[PDB]
Design a protein around this ligand. Structure first.
Ligand SMILES: N=C(N)c1ccc(OCCCCCCOc2ccc(C(=N)N)cc2)cc1
Lengths: 186, 186
């Protein structure tokens, strides 16, 4: 599983030194693989990275699946998931390498394409919550996909453009948002 | 021009590339000058940047007023500000850039001050719209600043993380957002 070993070493290198400074050379030697093996599995560093991001997205889903059982109703799942997105990124190691990578390829439709497939995976969480909320009379939404992209992006905005305020303040605003939003659906 | 020529080329590269991707080296050469230049008015690099942000924030908040007249109620004002956010050429095209900046100077204090003193200029627009809406009885918000902040960030989110798809689809979501947010306020 040196494909797996490469993803691992790469994740760590990226975390320690960021996207730009990490060279496939380091990855090659530290994972005891080769330029060729690395080329055959990911073709480029960008792809390698995107690959990691999907693995990460997967772990996040897996995590959410276990964590969402703490929330009985969908209203609750909405409140909870948003809180998680805020508190977890506070200490997500890849966070900084992602920003680096993102704000460096959002100009390439090639990379930008896959970047959306990934983004869409994170949006499904909402889609599910919303779909389920319907089938339980918690709310009635006839445009799930829509409200889903909206929630996703609104929430990511609160997580991304607030950092400085103290952590409780943020959690507070987020929960406030989760309230206002959920309220304007009934 | 002298000073107001660098600022120009700067803003240009800060958007075209990242905050790091672009450096004084590039700015100087493409703005035909020397290093010294960038020192009396332009101390640090984050000085020239923090500057540019200020310019853009002002330009935007001004274009807003030279355009909010087209909205009789505040409910409409809210909607319009958010819709316009998506089409301007001011401030918002630097969110990606700002993100890097903040995530590379959040370890210092001279940042969480300007980078936070600008937050007022950023949420003011919503504060007025929400306060005035209270006097005008369109709604009743007793935690304006919270709501103002939550909105400023939710919106920035929708504008920033959808920036690469059908511009008219953006405008649609943004309106379903304004719709849903306002409906949750009462
Ligand atoms: N192994 C772990 N311990 C771990 C892994 C992943 C993780 O991930 C946290 C992820 C937060 C993701 C927020 C994504 O927000 C958006 C994504 C896409 C879009 C879009 N529509 N373009 C908008 C917001 C946290 C922990």
């Amino acid at each position: 599983n040196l494909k797996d070993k490469i993803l691992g070493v790469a994740k760590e290198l990226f975390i320690k030194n960021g996207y730009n400074a990490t060279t496939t050379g380091e990855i090659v030697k530290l994972s005891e693989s080769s330029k060729g093996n690395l080329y055959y599995h990911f073709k480029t560093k960008e792809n390698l990275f995107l690959e990691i991001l999907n693995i990460e997205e997967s772990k996040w889903q897996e995590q959410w699946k276990k964590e969402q059982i703490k929330a009985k109703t969908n209203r609750e799942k909405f409140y909870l998931y948003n809180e998680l997105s805020l508190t977890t990124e506070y200490y997500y190691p890849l966070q900084n390498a992602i920003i680096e990578f993102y704000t460096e390829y959002y100009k390439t439709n090639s990379i930008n394409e896959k970047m959306n497939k990934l983004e869409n995976k994170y949006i499904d969480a909402y889609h599910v919550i919303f779909k389920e909320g319907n089938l339980n009379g918690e709310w009635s939404i006839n445009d799930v996909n829509a409200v889903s992209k909206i929630a996703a992006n609104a929430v990511n905005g609160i997580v991304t453009f607030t950092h400085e305020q103290n952590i409780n303040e943020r959690i507070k605003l987020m929960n406030k948002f989760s309230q206002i939003f959920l309220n304007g659906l009934s």
